[PDB]
């Protein structure tokens, strides 16, 4: 840090506390909006129901019709 | 303004050492600085220094050899026990063979070796090697 005073513990803790939010990984983890946006709700696996089969085109020059399922 | 007289006094001495000056003059003199210089002198890292005092804060002229690589200062003066003294010297000294962390104690200003053999801690002042 830069303010290394003898009794600046609260200043340092507050600065660290409100500057960790700028890290998008920490903010995404600790904000419920990202967890709500995640379809699984912070779950590794989830059961779904098949609706249709979709052939999606690939990216730039590597191009192919990949197979996907609307679940 | 000037907050720590000890800090810039050591920094001026270190700069003179890096530039290889024969002797260095530090403008302010304090009891802490005099004890610090005596501690280094008794370990042979400096020469024979004089104190030139008017009826104000005096000056100190210190004769310098080439043995001192760096005379650092730690700010603020943290409180160190004998449990964490080994960690402090591990993170602040080149090796376990040499280097001295001078920290003022109940007995007075003395290095970590003398602090250990008297079994007492205190405020950390600085380091030199």
């Amino acid at each position: 840090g830069k303010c290394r005073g003898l009794r600046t513990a609260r200043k340092l803790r507050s600065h660290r506390r409100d500057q960790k939010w700028h890290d998008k990984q920490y903010k995404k983890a600790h904000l419920g909006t990202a967890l709500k946006a995640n379809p699984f709700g912070g779950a590794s696996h989830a059961k779904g129901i098949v609706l249709e089969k979709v052939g999606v085109e690939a990216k730039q020059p590597n191009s192919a019709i990949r197979k996907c399922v609307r679940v | 303004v000037r907050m720590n007289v000890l800090a810039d006094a050591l920094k001026s001495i270190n700069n003179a050492e890096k530039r290889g000056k024969r002797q260095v003059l530090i403008r302010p003199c304090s009891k802490v600085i005099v004890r610090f210089l005596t501690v280094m002198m008794k370990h042979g890292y400096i020469g024979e220094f004089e104190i030139i005092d008017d009826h104000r804060a005096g000056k100190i002229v210190v004769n310098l050899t080439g043995r001192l690589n760096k005379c650092g200062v730690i700010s603020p003066r943290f409180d160190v026990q004998l449990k964490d003294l080994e960690k402090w010297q591990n993170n602040l000294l080149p090796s376990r063979q040499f280097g001295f962390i001078v920290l003022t104690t109940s007995a007075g200003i003395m290095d970590h070796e003398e602090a250990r053999r008297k079994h007492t801690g205190g405020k950390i002042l600085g380091f030199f090697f």
């Binding site: - | 043995r67 063979q97 040499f98």
Partner: protein
Amino acid sequence: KEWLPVTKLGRLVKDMKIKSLEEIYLFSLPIKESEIIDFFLGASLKDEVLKIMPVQKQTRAGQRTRFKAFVAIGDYNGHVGLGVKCSKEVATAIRGAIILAKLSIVPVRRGYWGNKIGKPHTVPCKVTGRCGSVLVRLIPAPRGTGIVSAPVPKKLLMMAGIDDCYTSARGCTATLGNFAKATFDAISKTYSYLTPDLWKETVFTKSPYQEFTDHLVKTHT
């Protein structure tokens, strides 16, 4: 095959006037020929190839691609060198890099961690070395610790003979050349780092030139 000396030091070392290599390092004499190194420490001189980096410069005729070879050489006791050279073919690049590494071989100082029993094992002091951006810090370690380091400088330290050492790497260590030269600098300035046991007033010994001056003007022009 036989070596004909060109330099003043080379004549003396061929005539065996200087028995050991450390005299040259003592007097800071520049070693300009590679026949001194293998004469002195060729018994246990081992070489490894670090990286072949194909640098290119672009002209109207596309790019003139030539290969740059990094060579790490040295014996496992106290002496190591690093060679860098770029040539248009791999074989010549290696042959030119190894001789540069031999010319650039530098002695190292080994110390003790805590207790000083037996032979030295680790770096005497916390020493840093940096070229460009990469910074490599060497920390003393107790006996049997090993070389806790990245693979690239681990082999250099093993060749340096320091079998116990902690390292800290700062910066873009992906660049092999910067990484190699940074740790080479770190292990080369150990003998230039002042140590309290070196406080003894050294006595200036006899320089090889002033000690064999008659021989120099007698055995050659």
